[PDB]
């Protein structure tokens, strides 16, 4: 089950309208309080007018709406279940504007919801674009609208939340499909649950930012339940999903052909591990005691070319273990991994001890010192985040987390780690004065301007519980070493939530839950539009356009020449990301030093060190003097 973010509005005075309503299934059957009566569009003798079908409500008075619920027919029949849909809010009953929520509701008889930022309105319109099985009907047993306690208009210059993307599953794991710009999401064997899985099946869901369509597909060809996996985009552009519910499986996702291909089994069964792409395109992983057993699981490396997993026993997991009260089950989880120079992988945390992992021979591990600062040694930060915002200067920003996986207080701790050559103890300092809000289970993404967007989480880690939630996201600005609070959202994003940077420079944040009958399952996501896509007036700014690219596939050290429609001041490459359980080892940013060829023509060189410029798919972004970024041009980097 799920839940609305506000309280139900009294449906007494209400006035309802429908496009079609067969006698006996009146428009008002939907707001009568009886779950055995339902509105139903024309059918049979009145014909079967196919969808879309519209349900409009005049609440008579103005209410601070923040959500709605739709209850399907409970008589045992499937006819009328809504699939694709949109939710509009109006003040006048003519001008509906943009949809506050849209997506696709799962095919079943459970109550569906649409939760979105509070917006005062008098009318509510639920459009049923499609029917869960392709039939011509729309039948709503009970429909409700919700209101928040009060309305506070967003503050100017602090970004905006919305719209809401309704999903058929709980996106506990996601990635951007680089060749198509689609958001791939997956839950487990069930749409809202992982517990009690027979293995070999994964429900996936996609969202196309261009078209706004939510489409789900069931994957069984890789015989893999991809819940709690390791995720890495290899040197060949394929996404490498490892272990989880099916602890030894490896599933590969090819963006080009939009298909899943079976991969070789890992040497050691794992779950909740972290995998990181190396400078040569291979994939390194270590830890992961959530599944496949609880014992010392050392590093191993996957080769895209030979399609093999090779064990690296001497790349010891031991030195990176936290002091979790639940022991090894949690202590080797979600390592903060970063692919670096000469096949090395840097482990920044969550453990206090940081280390260097080597992939030559049978592997090796070398101590890199402790995450610290003048404020002292930093404690184990399980489920804290790590983001490489300037790979060129080996800059990593770390923050949040707690001593233990759960029943542990979050910290406001934040550090700036500065990598050098593999083997040398990197420099670390405190980041400003830490986070505004202590949080764990939160998520982050590096933005085009190098700033890091931090959102969601709770003050105290309690999986599946929406307590002590932080609704105010923060953004760190490296040039000022300052954190800035942004406009708050209304949906709790804790355990099992994700965040990804979209090709358009906006943030996709969603999920949380995945606990079956719990009321904390969030089958949605929202879009955050940073202040950089707005001008002084609060309007959407004109974005520079990348009119030409000399090539879209470049070797490390190679050069690219572009043409824009206006003069650009800054440019940056951002590696496509994947996300789950606060881990994202794929995203990273590269600040570009531009050469002005004149006439709005520019050139730049991709870093020759593939350890900085990891192979795979990247996003090219250009910014004008105003700071407004263009949409991204996809560049494939190869070694």
559 pairs with which residues across the strands? Answer: 605
Shortest CB 140 distance to Na ion, Å: 8
As given in the structure block, the two tokens for residue 43 are: 């059918």
Instruction: For the CB of residue 129, give the shortest distance to Na ion in the complex, in Å.
Output: 22
Number of chain positions touching Na ion (CB under 5 A): 4
Interface residues for Na ion in 145-204 (CB under 5 A)? none
Cα–Cα dist 293/300, whole Å = 16
13: buried, middle or exposed (CB in 10 Å: 19+, 13-18, 0-12)? Answer: exposed
Give the Cα separation of 12 and 534 in Å (integer).
41
Q: Is 272 annotated as a binding residue?
A: yes
How far is residue 519's CA from residue 467's CA, in Å, rounded to a whole number? 13
Q: Judged by CB under 5 A, which stretch of 31-39, 120-128, 196-204, 237-245 contacts Na ion?
A: 31-39
Rounded to whole angstroms, the Cα distance separating 15 from 27 reads 10
Q: Which two tokens stand for residue 106?
A: 């799962």
Minimum CB distance to Na ion, residue 31 (Å): 7
Stretch that binds Na ion, among 22-30, 82-90, 108-116, 513-521 (CB under 5 A): 22-30
Tell me whether residue 495 is annotated as binding. Answer: yes
Between CA 493 and CA 473 the distance in angstroms is 11
490 close to 469: Cβ distance less than 8 angstroms: no
Q: Which is nearer to Na ion, 22 or 236 (CB)?
A: 22
| C-alpha–C-alpha distance, residues 264 and 187, integer Å | 22
Binders of Na ion in range 283-342 (CB under 5 A): none
69 lies in the site for Na ion, by CB under 5 A? no
Which one among 1, 19, 22, 32 touches Na ion, defined by CB under 5 A?
32
Torsions phi, psi for 226 (to 5 deg): -80, 25
Contact 248, 285 (CB under 8 A): no
- Minimum distance from CB of 409 to Na ion (Å)? 46
If one asks whether residue 34 binds Na ion (CB under 5 A), the answer comes out as yes
Residue 364 touching Na ion (CB under 5 A):
no
Q: How far is the CB of 32 from Na ion (least distance, A)?
A: 5
Distance CA(286)–CA(604), nearest Å, equals: 36
Q: Give the nearer residue to Na ion in terms of CB position, either 11 or 182.
A: 11
Under rule CB under 5 A, residue 37 binds Na ion:
yes
User: Any known ligand binding at 581?
Assistant: yes
In this complex, which beta carbon is closest to Na ion, that of residue 144 or of residue 499? 144
Kindly compute the dihedral angle of the four CA atoms of residues 335, 341, 343, 349, in this order, to the nearest 10 degrees. -10
Collapse the DSSP code of 503 into the 3-class scheme (helix H, G, I; strand E, B; otherwise coil) and give the result.
coil
Tell me which stretch binds Na ion (CB under 5 A): 35-43, 338-346, 608-616, 629-637: 35-43
- Comparing every residue's Cβ against Na ion, the nearest one is 37
**Which CB atom, from 32 or from 58, has the smaller least distance to Na ion?**
32
Question: Running DSSP on this structure, what letter comes out for residue 289?
Answer: B
Residues annotated as catalytic are: 495
Contact between 500 and 444 under an 8 Å Cβ cutoff? The reply is no
Of 29 and 570, the one with the shorter C-beta distance to Na ion is: 29
Using the rule CB under 5 A, give the single segment among 16-24, 32-40, 347-355, 572-580 that binds Na ion. Answer: 32-40
CA dihedral 238, 243, 248, 253 (to 10 degrees): -20
C-beta of 11 vs 459, nearer to Na ion: 11
Q: How far is the CB of 142 from Na ion (least distance, A)?
A: 5
**Which residues of this protein are in contact with Na ion, per CB under 5 A?**
29, 32, 34, 37
Residues tagged in the binding site annotation: 272, 495-496, 581
Annotated binding site for Cu cation: 272, 495-496, 581
């Amino acid at each position: 089950a799920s839940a609305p973010i506000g309280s139900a509005i009294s449906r007494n005075n209400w006035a309802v309208t429908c496009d079609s309503a067969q006698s006996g299934n009146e428009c008002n059957k939907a707001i009568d309080g009886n779950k055995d009566t339902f509105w139903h569009t024309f059918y049979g003798a009145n014909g079967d007018p196919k969808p879309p079908h519209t349900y409009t409500i005049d609440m008579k008075t103005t209410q601070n709406v923040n959500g709605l619920s739709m209850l399907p027919r409970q008589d045992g029949n499937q006819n009328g279940w809504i699939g694709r849909h949109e939710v509009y809010l109006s003040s006048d009953g003519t001008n509906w504007g943009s949809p506050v929520a849209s997506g696709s509701w799962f095919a079943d008889s459970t109550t569906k919801y649409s939760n979105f930022e509070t917006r005062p309105a008098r009318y509510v319109r639920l459009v049923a674009i499609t029917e869960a099985n392709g039939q011509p009907w729309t039948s709503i047993a009970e429909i409700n609208v919700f209101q928040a306690s009060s309305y506070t208009a967003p503050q100017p210059g602090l970004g905006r939340w919305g719209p809401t993307i309704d999903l058929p599953i709980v996106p506990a794991a996601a990635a951007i499909e680089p060749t198509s710009g689609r958001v791939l999401m997956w839950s487990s064997y069930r749409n809202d649950a992982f517990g009690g899985s027979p293995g070999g099946i994964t429900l996936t869901s996609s969202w196309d930012p261009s078209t706004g369509i939510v489409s789900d597909r069931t994957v069984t060809v890789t015989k893999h339940d991809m819940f709690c996996p390791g995720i890495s985009m290899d040197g060949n552009g394929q996404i490498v999903v490892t272990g989880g519910n099916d602890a030894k499986k490896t599933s590969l996702y090819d963006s080009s052909s939009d298909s899943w291909i079976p991969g070789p089994d890992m040497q050691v069964a794992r779950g909740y591990q972290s995998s990181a792409t190396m400078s040569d395109g291979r994939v390194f992983t270590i830890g992961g005691s959530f599944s496949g057993g609880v014992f010392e699981k050392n590093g191993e490396v996957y080769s895209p070319s030979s399609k093999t997993w090779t064990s690296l026993p001497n790349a010891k997991v031991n030195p990176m273990l936290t002091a979790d009260k639940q022991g090894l089950y949690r202590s080797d989880n979600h390592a903060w991994l970063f692919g670096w120079k000469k096949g090395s992988v840097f482990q920044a945390g969550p453990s206090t001890a940081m280390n260097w992992y080597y992939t030559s021979g049978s592997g090796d591990v070398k101590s890199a010192g402790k995450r610290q600062s003048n404020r002292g040694v930093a404690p184990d930060a399980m489920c804290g985040n790590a983001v490489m915002y300037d790979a060129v200067k080996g800059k990593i920003l770390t923050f949040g987390g707690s001593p233990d996986y759960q029943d542990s207080d979050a910290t406001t701790n934040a550090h700036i780690i500065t990598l050098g050559e593999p083997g040398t103890s990197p420099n670390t300092v405190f980041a400003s004065n830490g986070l505004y809000f202590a949080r764990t289970f939160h998520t982050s993404v590096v933005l085009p301007d190098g700033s890091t967007f931090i959102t969601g989480g709770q003050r105290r880690g309690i999986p599946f519980e929406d307590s002590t939630p932080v609704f105010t996201p923060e953004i760190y600005v490296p040039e000022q070493d300052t954190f800035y609070k942004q406009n708050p959202n209304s949906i709790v994003r804790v355990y099992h939530s994700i965040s990804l940077l979209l090709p358009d420079g906006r943030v996709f944040n969603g999920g949380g839950g995945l606990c079956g009958d719990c009321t904390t399952n969030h089958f949605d996501a929202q879009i955050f539009t940073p202040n950089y896509l707005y001008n002084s007036n609060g309007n959407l700014a004109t974005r520079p356009k990348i009119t030409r690219t000399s090539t879209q596939s470049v070797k490390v050290g190679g050069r690219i020449t572009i043409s824009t429609d206006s003069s650009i001041s800054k440019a940056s490459l951002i590696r496509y990301g994947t996300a789950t359980h606060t881990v994202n080892t794929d995203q990273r940013r590269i600040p570009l030093t531009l050469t002005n060829n004149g006439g709005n023509s520019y050139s730049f060189q991709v870093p020759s060190d593939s350890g900085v410029a990891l192979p795979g798919y990247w996003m090219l972004f250009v910014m004008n003097s105003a700071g407004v970024p263009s949409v991204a041009s996809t560049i494939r980097v190869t070694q």
